[PDB]
Structures are given as structure tokens and as C-alpha cells.
Design a binder for this molecule. Structure first.
Ligand SMILES: *[C@@H]1O[C@H](CO)[C@@H](O[C@@H]2O[C@H](CO)[C@@H](O)[C@H](O)[C@H]2NC(C)=O)[C@H](O)[C@H]1NC(C)=O
Ligand SMILES: *[C@@H]1O[C@H](CO)[C@@H](O)[C@H](O)[C@H]1NC(C)=O
Lengths: 49, 49, 46
């Protein structure tokens, strides 16, 4: 949102910074019965099991 | 009905699993549309069995 | 035969509906070449 100032302009950039994160046992891909699979939007993760 | 078209030239297309991928669930989906698509495998099996 | 390859490297593949979408009616485009794609459902009903 722009904001006027005397002989200048002041912005109010609204950002989106990720908060706390957890560690996961990712993997490049996945395959069942001899058929490699790949992620389509995100990245694979693992709850642990 | 809905279409899937590129972002620079209007090319309306029949939404299909051909050019669409799934990474979520209706519960997780907001304003989910109870809208169906075409699967090019069901009618063929019943016709020729 | 007709093959679908990536942009830079040359890696031919069997032209399949999984790697190609549909649009239009083929009656308006120019340069269309008649060809057959593979339907995976055929072996499942033999
Ligand atoms: C899309 O389908 C969902 C499937 O549950 C519908 O959700 C239910 O719709 C019925 C319709 O009478 C309601 O009684 C339920 O309360 C809804 N929720 C559940 C958990 O059953 C949803 O309404 C459908 N959307 C539209 C626009 O019809
Ligand atoms: C491609 O198939 C259509 C289907 O009828 C036919 O009319 C057309 O002549 C074919 N193309 C060529 C080059 O023969």
C-alpha cells in the first residue's frame, strides 16, 4: 500500500514469511509394482512410517 | 462447464486427467466444486468387456 | 514413426495421451499428421 510523505513516498510491503518448520525424511520419487512415480505439485515427506 | 486453457491464448479444453494432477482432498479443498471430469477408461471396458 | 522428445536433448518416446493433451477439432490447425497413439486399456480386456 503506498503512503505519501513530504518530498517522498513510503511503502508498506505486506510479506509472507514461513514460520517454524519440521524435519522430514524426503525422497526423490516413488514407485509401486515396478512403476516409478514423481511428485506433481509438492515434495514427498515422511511422518516416520 | 469449465475448461483448462493456457495463460496467454484462449484455448478452451475439456478438463481431463490427461492435463491435471491431484494433490489434495475435498475436506482440505476450499469451495470444492462437485464437478466431474472425463476418464477415458470406464465406458470402453463395459462396451467391449 | 512419430516420437515426442524433450526440447534440448533427444530422447524419443512412444507418443501417448499421458504426455499429450487434446484441443480443438483438428479441422482448423495446419500441418496435422495422421498418427495413432497407445490406449493402455486395450491389454486389460484381452
Ligand atoms: C458436494 O458434495 C458434498 C458431499 O458431502 C456435499 O456436502 C454435504 O451436502 C449435503 C447436501 O444435503 C449436506 O446435507 C451435508 O451437510 C454436506 N456435508 C456433509 C459432511 O455431508 C456438498 O453439499 C456438495 N455440494 C453441493 C454444492 O451440492
Ligand atoms: C487423415 O484422416 C482423415 C480421416 O478421414 C482423412 O480424411 C485424411 O485424408 C487423412 N490424412 C491424409 C493425409 O490422408
Amino acid at each position: 500500500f503506498p503512503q505519501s510523505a513530504p518530498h517522498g513516498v513510503v511503502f508498506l510491503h505486506v510479506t509472507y514469511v514461513p514460520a517454524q518448520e519440521k524435519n522430514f525424511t524426503t525422497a526423490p520419487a516413488i514407485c509401486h509394482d515396478g512403476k516409478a512415480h514423481f511428485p506433481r505439485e509438492g515434495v514427498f515427506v515422511s511422518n516416520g512410517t | 462447464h469449465w475448461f483448462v486453457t493456457q495463460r496467454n491464448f484462449y484455448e478452451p479444453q475439456i478438463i481431463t486427467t490427461d492435463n491435471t494432477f491431484v494433490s489434495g482432498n475435498c475436506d482440505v479443498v476450499i469451495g470444492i466444486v462437485n464437478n466431474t471430469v472425463y476418464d477415458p477408461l470406464q465406458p470402453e471396458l463395459d462396451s467391449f468387456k
